[PDB]
Amino acid sequence: MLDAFSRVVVNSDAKAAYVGGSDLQALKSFIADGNKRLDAVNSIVSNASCMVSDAVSGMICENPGLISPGGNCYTNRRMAACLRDGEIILRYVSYALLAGDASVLEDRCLNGLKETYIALGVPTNSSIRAVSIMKAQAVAFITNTATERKMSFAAGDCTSLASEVASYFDRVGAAIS
Amino acid sequence: MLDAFSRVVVNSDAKAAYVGGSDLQALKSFIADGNKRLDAVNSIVSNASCMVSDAVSGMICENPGLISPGGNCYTNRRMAACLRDGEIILRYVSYALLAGDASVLEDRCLNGLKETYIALGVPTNSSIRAVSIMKAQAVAFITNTATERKMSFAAGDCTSLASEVASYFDRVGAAIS
Amino acid sequence: MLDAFSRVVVNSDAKAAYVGGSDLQALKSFIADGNKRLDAVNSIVSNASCMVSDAVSGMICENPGLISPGGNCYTNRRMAACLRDGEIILRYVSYALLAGDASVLEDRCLNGLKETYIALGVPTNSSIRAVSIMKAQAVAFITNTATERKMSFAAGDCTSLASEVASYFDRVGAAIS
Amino acid sequence: EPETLDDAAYQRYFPARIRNKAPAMEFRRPSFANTEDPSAYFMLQKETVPLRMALAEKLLTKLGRKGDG
Amino acid sequence: MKSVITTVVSAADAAGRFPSNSDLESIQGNIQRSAARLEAAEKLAGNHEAVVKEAGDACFAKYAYLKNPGEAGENQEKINKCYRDVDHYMRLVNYCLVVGGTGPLDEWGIAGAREVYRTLNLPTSAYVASIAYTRDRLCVPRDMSAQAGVEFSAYLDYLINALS
Amino acid sequence: MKSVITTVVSAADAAGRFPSNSDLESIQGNIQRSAARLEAAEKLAGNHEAVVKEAGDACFAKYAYLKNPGEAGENQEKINKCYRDVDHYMRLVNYCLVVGGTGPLDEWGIAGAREVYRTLNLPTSAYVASIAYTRDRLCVPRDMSAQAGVEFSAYLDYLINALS
Amino acid sequence: MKSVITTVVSAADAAGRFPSNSDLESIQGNIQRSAARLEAAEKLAGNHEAVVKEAGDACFAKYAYLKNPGEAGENQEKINKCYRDVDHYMRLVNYCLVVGGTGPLDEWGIAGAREVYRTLNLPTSAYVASIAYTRDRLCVPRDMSAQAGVEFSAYLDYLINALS
Amino acid sequence: LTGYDSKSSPNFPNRAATRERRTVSFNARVARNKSQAKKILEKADEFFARSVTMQYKAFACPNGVYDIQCTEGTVKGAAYEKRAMAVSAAFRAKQASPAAKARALFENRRHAIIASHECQHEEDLFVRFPKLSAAYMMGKTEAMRTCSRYVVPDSLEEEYMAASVDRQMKERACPGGVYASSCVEGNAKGQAEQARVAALATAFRSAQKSASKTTAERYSSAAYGRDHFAHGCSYEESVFNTYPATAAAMRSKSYNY
């Protein structure tokens, strides 16, 4: 919808004023790591076959009662539709990363999930345990400290990149609370 | 080409790569004191099978309660899994000498070893006592001050790399401390 | 649909062969002139509303019978439908210029258009002069020879696309008449 | 074949696959000093360290007692 | 509002997938133009209060039939509010140089403009005069660089091709 | 073909509009990326027979059980088909570098490959183990640039996270 | 769910007519298998506890191969988990042969089955070695009459024609 | 070379004079050998129009059981009048205006290319066969419940957000103050109210979906109007993202409704 290029134009529509050399310097630094942002989504799309897979096993090996008789993901009609519930939130977060803001995420998908989840009976309590399994593996692939797959990048600092992806997943728990 | 060397280990499936006569000069121009370095890591991997045998047996020789019934060096498949693991540190800290940095040692080998060993019933104070033998064994091979067998090198000093591997074994020791 | 990069591999797919340095150099010169190609389609979109409003009276200045009662171009609606007819077949040739291949207009605009004009009684002797009038204006913009408009371009020759733009115009009237 | 042994307990630490996997390296130095040698070559092949039951028997029997629990 | 990289992700969920490898090739290209275009935004920024009154009375120098009553341009505060109506068209044409695309243009300058200019009888030919009055004097090596000089006018004639 | 040129004209066609300059930024990103992408494809056209043989030897090294009867490698004529099945991938990986997008891959090789592999009892676990050996032992300064070793290797793991 | 009753009761409502006399003829055909099919349900319900072992051990003889690392059988877990896995499919043939249709299987067993096996890498060709072993085991003189041998053996062949 | 020469075949089209001939002999000589492929590609696209209308009913009948979506009857013989009204109007829509002929064609060759999400084989079929693209839309837009009969409001305001757009959507029906023949109730003495009596049955029981059937249809309609009308109109997407019945009642075709 609107990007980080437009995020200062969000404010500038209600200024009765413009954006010039007062706010370009906050956008000038976005170009200086514009190679870095395009280099730090190339890790996220590189393991799309291990982002939604180990997430849903991360809650089975902690709370295994969800596949018990009396479960929400009991049969294959439910849990194959759980891996589609957990993949499209990896989809609308990677659109938000190239935009620099959650304007794609917070209106296309997460605009009121507490009338599609409490209307179904989905367990919200271990949905957020299914969130931080992917967040802890998102910051672990931003850095090259993943114990399985190393990635060849140009050297430099990406703590501003690693802190930003944690600050995308935080409002997911807010959208279900 | 150390980043391409790092992708042989970190990529979570076994590959193979080797270095001919042309690109051996690429490694000597890349790594500082590499003729001292490749002599050092050759003098650990050539005698590692003797090095794991004295490391577990000195743990028995100063603590003979491991081979007691109910002990953790009882029931010889369990005793074989020490001898599997005892070179796995020496496979990886030789690789820490080769890359010049213990980042690949940390996430692939040291990460999670503290919680694994209390899950299985490993006595951790003997586990530091096993690796401290291997810390003392490598610096007698790098400095060639080993009592039994000696190796052939061009003359000079290698005490910087002896201190460099001594900064790698306490990373194994403080991970399981 | 099928752009220039897709065209060079779809006639090489029936080869069951790779695409090496025999025809990539003809494509490497296509991306050399790509800066001049974006410096060609800019000269068409910038002057759209003049040149569509141009020929609709430039057609009837030669043939005044089209505004006569019982005319095809006689009323307000049949002209208002003619002007919105007018830039469709020129926005599609701009697509062919920006994508380097004529495979977007001859499947979405020349896909049976002589079929529909016979169903309405639209004349074709006028519809090919009404695009040849709008053809010479397209070579007098990519080559800066307009007499009331000047685009500041660098020093270079534009006969590379002068016949090629008209190549996307003579195929129009041939397959609608 | 291996077996299983898998009390999912370190399951989520080392996984089923990355378990006892390690590098392995070989060194052939040049033959004479300060001359270029085409025969000098160096492996860095990743290889899974096996269980090694054979020298496990001769080390337990030489040190303590039976080991047959 | 459609810019360079909010469009290619509006089509990336339109198929229901992830970003591709060519999806990142698009985002490199505005980085090639996020220096040559942001100088053109700065030239409008520190000169906008000079060009509102410059091209403002330009159109009043064209149409003498507004200067007599029978129009909405009789008294002074209409012409003061006319110079307000200039300032909105420079507020959002400055915005598009920041984001790269024709995003802010199509929303509140292009769409819906037909009703409140034709039922309100304020002619679109009177607007395109002062739009072209900014466009017919681009001093290319003086005010900006050579590449800002060609794309600043390319946003200027967008309201030309739409409204007239 | 899903290339960056097609994705910006298909959204241009759907809106009933002209080619706007917002898409022209994405075409500028091609000619910057095209030189660091074609020589990944030019080196692949001169090395394809030596890389496809060296790939399938790790397919049978990681899973040596396929030589059993009833599997997909019991006789010589379908082990010959295994090298043909994997050469067709590494030709479509060459085809998609020249286009720049993922166009030929997800349409020719990928779409419909799931419901025929489990049909003829072919695992995809050995298919992804063939290219992951190819994608790993390739030193980014030794064979090509530091950019083509990023972009081309971004196409090989596109298969792995679409097959798994 | 699918049965003799619920299938034919649908077209009465979905065409908006009464219960016919042709659907009354259809439940009469369910009486002719009611004392002919339900003997196999009480057969296996007191028989699974020994055939969950010998048909769970049946696939690993074919695939000793899955067992080692990088695959489906990596650890015990799938099987202690793996034996629980196969005790859900013929747990449903006790649910399918008691109802009269494939209702408990086409909505609980195959729906979404190929999608949780591609992502979680479970080889579908070992379930073809798991319960079709019981098809090659079944003795019509000793175990149960040839009416179960035409109906219990039929419902298994529904499943191998579904997981392939 | 084959023989002493290679002349063209007399079975090739456009081989005779057609200069000063009679009307009977002019038309016989322009359609000489073209009649076969015109009738080959006439039964081709009619089979395509018969094939995709089958492949979307498989979702309507999952695993061999009929859902509440079929429901062509509610009272005794409540499909006989629905039989006539569906097939008599199909002739009424085949005697339309000659402006709406290609308006149907070129717009069916617009929306289907959008909905076929980048599959080059599929857009090549939609350009040659206009009957296939007329059947691709109404099959998929009824498979995913998006048109008019299943997107019921849940708030109180959405009944006027429906009512604001539809009577403004029926600017397409009435050309001026006259009506059209494309929007006709029926033509029998009861068929006017016989269209109403089914029209309340089909809205009522379709408001009795499951919790999964409404929560999966309230996002499929949102992205439907997000790539058919509001390609960049973020204000229209500001009602299309949270209020899906707005994003569903507006129909992508010039249906003359």
Ligand SMILES: C=CC1=C(C)[C@@H](Cc2[nH]c(/C=C3N=C(/C=C4\NC(=O)[C@H](C)[C@H]4CC)C(C)=C\3CCC(=O)O)c(CCC(=O)O)c2C)NC1=O
């Ligand atoms: C409960 C059951 C269970 C699993 C199924 C696995 C899966 C798994 N892996 C990680 C943790 C991780 N997971 C990955 C994932 C991958 N690496 C790749 O190359 C692939 C593309 C992808 C797998 C398909 C990476 C890179 C890390 C960080 C490094 C590591 O911890 O190994 C986590 C994070 C823990 C958390 O939630 O906080 C989980 C659940 N581990 C478990 O405990």
Ligand SMILES: C=CC1=C(C)[C@@H](Cc2[nH]c(/C=C3N=C(/C=C4\NC(=O)[C@H](C)[C@H]4CC)C(C)=C\3CCC(=O)O)c(CCC(=O)O)c2C)NC1=O
């Ligand atoms: C079209 C496809 C496309 C891509 C795949 C990326 C690829 C990419 N990454 C970087 C370049 C980079 N990427 C990183 C990022 C990192 N380095 C690390 O060691 C960290 C692990 C990680 C942070 C998360 C850094 C630090 C640079 C160098 C540039 C900089 O420091 O700003 C560059 C710049 C190099 C150059 O221009 O010569 C490019 C092109 N960009 C693209 O346009």
Ligand SMILES: C=CC1=C(C)[C@@H](Cc2[nH]c(/C=C3N=C(/C=C4\NC(=O)[C@H](C)[C@H]4CC)C(C)=C\3CCC(=O)O)c(CCC(=O)O)c2C)NC1=O
């Ligand atoms: C166009 C695609 C393309 C690739 C991705 C690479 C992949 C590749 N590498 C090698 C060939 C090789 N690859 C390596 C591996 C490496 N080499 C080193 O210097 C490091 C140690 C390590 C990378 C980090 C070695 C050592 C050889 C030579 C064979 C050998 O001596 O063992 C070969 C066979 C060619 C030969 O005969 O040598 C191929 C196809 N080459 C290509 O043409």
Ligand SMILES: C=CC1=C(C)[C@@H](Cc2[nH]c(/C=C3N=C(/C=C4\NC(=O)[C@H](C)[C@H]4CC)C(C)=C\3CCC(=O)O)c(CCC(=O)O)c2C)NC1=O
């Ligand atoms: C029963 C009681 C018992 C022990 C207490 C230990 C004896 C022992 N030896 C070494 C010490 C060592 N062990 C080796 C290992 C080797 N030397 C070689 O030449 C071979 C290649 C290789 C296997 C024999 C080396 C090189 C040293 C250091 C130098 C030395 O003391 O010999 C150490 C570590 C240094 C220290 O004392 O802190 C110990 C604890 N082994 C036992 O069995």
Ligand SMILES: C=CC1=C(C)[C@@H](Cc2[nH]c(/C=C3N=C(/C=C4\NC(=O)[C@H](C)[C@H]4CC)C(C)=C\3CCC(=O)O)c(CCC(=O)O)c2C)NC1=O
């Ligand atoms: C008797 C009826 C009659 C007319 C109404 C005019 C209209 C007209 N203009 C051009 C021809 C043209 N028309 C344009 C268009 C424009 N020129 C500009 O400077 C603007 C940017 C833009 C209008 C907004 C251009 C660039 C040419 C080519 C150069 C020229 O001959 O003027 C042609 C084509 C001549 C041909 O067929 O070859 C016609 C018919 N001429 C006539 O004979």
Ligand SMILES: C=CC1=C(C)[C@@H](Cc2[nH]c(/C=C3N=C(/C=C4\NC(=O)[C@H](C)[C@H]4CC)C(C)=C\3CCC(=O)O)c(CCC(=O)O)c2C)NC1=O
């Ligand atoms: C995003 C929008 C976008 C554009 C509009 C173009 C803008 C553009 N055009 C040219 C550059 C050029 N443009 C032309 C074109 C012409 N010269 C003539 O004499 C003819 C009238 C006309 C032919 C069609 C030529 C000849 C060059 C010089 C480069 C070359 O010759 O390859 C350059 C390179 C010069 C520079 O870097 O300053 C740029 C950036 N590029 C973009 O990225």
Ligand SMILES: C=CC1=C(C)[C@@H](Cc2[nH]c(/C=C3N=C(/C=C4\NC(=O)[C@H](C)[C@H]4CC)C(C)=C\3CCC(=O)O)c(CCC(=O)O)c2C)NC1=O
């Ligand atoms: C890939 C990386 C990798 C490693 C870092 C090592 C680490 C490691 N060690 C063991 C597993 C083990 N490690 C030991 C070792 C010991 N116990 C003691 O009491 C002694 C102090 C010490 C011997 C000197 C034993 C005994 C087991 C087996 C536990 C058991 O069988 O109960 C396991 C088993 C669980 C599993 O398979 O995941 C792993 C991962 N092995 C690897 O494959």
Ligand SMILES: C=CC1=C(C)[C@@H](Cc2[nH]c(/C=C3N=C(/C=C4\NC(=O)[C@H](C)[C@H]4CC)C(C)=C\3CCC(=O)O)c(CCC(=O)O)c2C)NC1=O
């Ligand atoms: C690929 C395989 C490969 C190797 C294994 C090394 C082997 C090696 N090292 C050195 C050469 C050397 N090697 C050492 C190393 C040592 N000397 C000591 O006294 C310490 C005990 C020990 C360090 C642990 C030193 C100090 C030199 C001389 C300085 C130097 O060249 O680095 C030389 C040059 C000899 C000559 O001039 O002819 C060679 C071939 N180099 C290689 O290319």
Ligand SMILES: C=CC1=C(C)[C@@H](Cc2[nH]c(/C=C3N=C(/C=C4\NC(=O)[C@H](C)[C@H]4CC)C(C)=C\3CCC(=O)O)c(CCC(=O)O)c2C)NC1=O
């Ligand atoms: C309540 C939901 C709602 C919609 C989905 C659209 C749908 C829609 N668009 C138009 C009509 C139009 N719709 C647009 C579209 C836009 N105009 C812009 O300035 C934006 C950039 C873009 C999204 C708002 C344009 C430019 C026209 C005029 C062209 C035409 O009539 O087709 C009309 C008929 C004219 C009228 O509105 O009276 C309708 C019903 N309009 C709506 O009221």
Ligand SMILES: C=CC1=C(C)[C@@H](Cc2[nH]c(/C=C3N=C(/C=C4\NC(=O)[C@H](C)[C@H]4CC)C(C)=C\3CCC(=O)O)c(CCC(=O)O)c2C)NC1=O
């Ligand atoms: C951000 C957009 C922007 C512009 C495009 C300019 C446009 C512009 N130029 C002038 C002002 C002027 N403009 C010119 C014109 C030119 N000068 C030359 O060297 C060329 C021959 C020719 C350009 C084509 C001259 C000669 C003056 C000053 C003297 C005068 O003519 O009044 C003025 C009046 C204010 C002043 O005195 O400067 C304005 C608004 N200013 C802006 O803020």
Ligand SMILES: C=CC1=C(C)[C@@H](Cc2[nH]c(/C=C3N=C(/C=C4\NC(=O)[C@H](C)[C@H]4CC)C(C)=C\3CCC(=O)O)c(CCC(=O)O)c2C)NC1=O
């Ligand atoms: C256009 C792109 C294109 C492809 C991707 C392949 C896809 C493909 N593969 C096979 C067919 C096959 N593919 C394999 C390949 C393998 N089995 C194994 O043991 C390994 C996992 C792997 C080799 C590494 C084998 C063995 C067959 C024969 C199976 C059979 O015909 O029964 C077939 C059936 C027709 C045929 O045999 O030719 C097709 C369509 N073919 C194509 O035309």
Ligand SMILES: C=CC1=C(C)[C@@H](Cc2[nH]c(/C=C3N=C(/C=C4\NC(=O)[C@H](C)[C@H]4CC)C(C)=C\3CCC(=O)O)c(CCC(=O)O)c2C)NC1=O
């Ligand atoms: C009621 C619905 C239902 C099913 C249809 C089955 C299917 C099924 N199996 C597993 C899960 C599993 N299934 C197997 C079984 C096997 N793996 C193989 O490689 C062999 C093909 C086979 C050996 C017999 C194993 C080993 C796991 C554990 C893998 C994991 O989930 O981590 C799961 C994940 C949740 C779970 O553990 O239950 C599901 C849904 N189980 C069910 O509960």
Ligand SMILES: C=CC1=C(C)[C@@H](Cc2[nH]c(/C=C3N=C(/C=C4\NC(=O)[C@H](C)[C@H]4CC)C(C)=C\3CCC(=O)O)c(CCC(=O)O)c2C)NC1=O
């Ligand atoms: C003026 C131009 C002109 C032509 C192009 C031909 C066109 C043409 N070809 C055939 C007829 C044919 N043409 C071919 C040719 C081919 N089929 C293939 O498999 C290959 C793709 C290709 C040649 C390599 C074949 C095989 C027949 C079939 C003859 C038969 O049916 O017996 C016929 C019908 C038989 C006849 O009328 O004699 C005609 C009109 N004739 C003309 O008069």
Ligand SMILES: C=CC1=C(C)[C@@H](Cc2[nH]c(/C=C3N=C(/C=C4\NC(=O)[C@H](C)[C@H]4CC)C(C)=C\3CCC(=O)O)c(CCC(=O)O)c2C)NC1=O
């Ligand atoms: C009469 C002509 C005719 C067609 C043109 C196709 C068009 C078509 N394709 C699919 C259905 C499909 N179509 C494709 C094909 C593709 N999707 C992709 O991801 C690729 C980009 C692209 C191939 C290049 C796939 C993969 C499916 C299954 C997924 C889905 O249902 O969308 C369906 C729905 C199937 C169903 O309802 O069960 C239809 C109507 N089918 C036809 O009957």
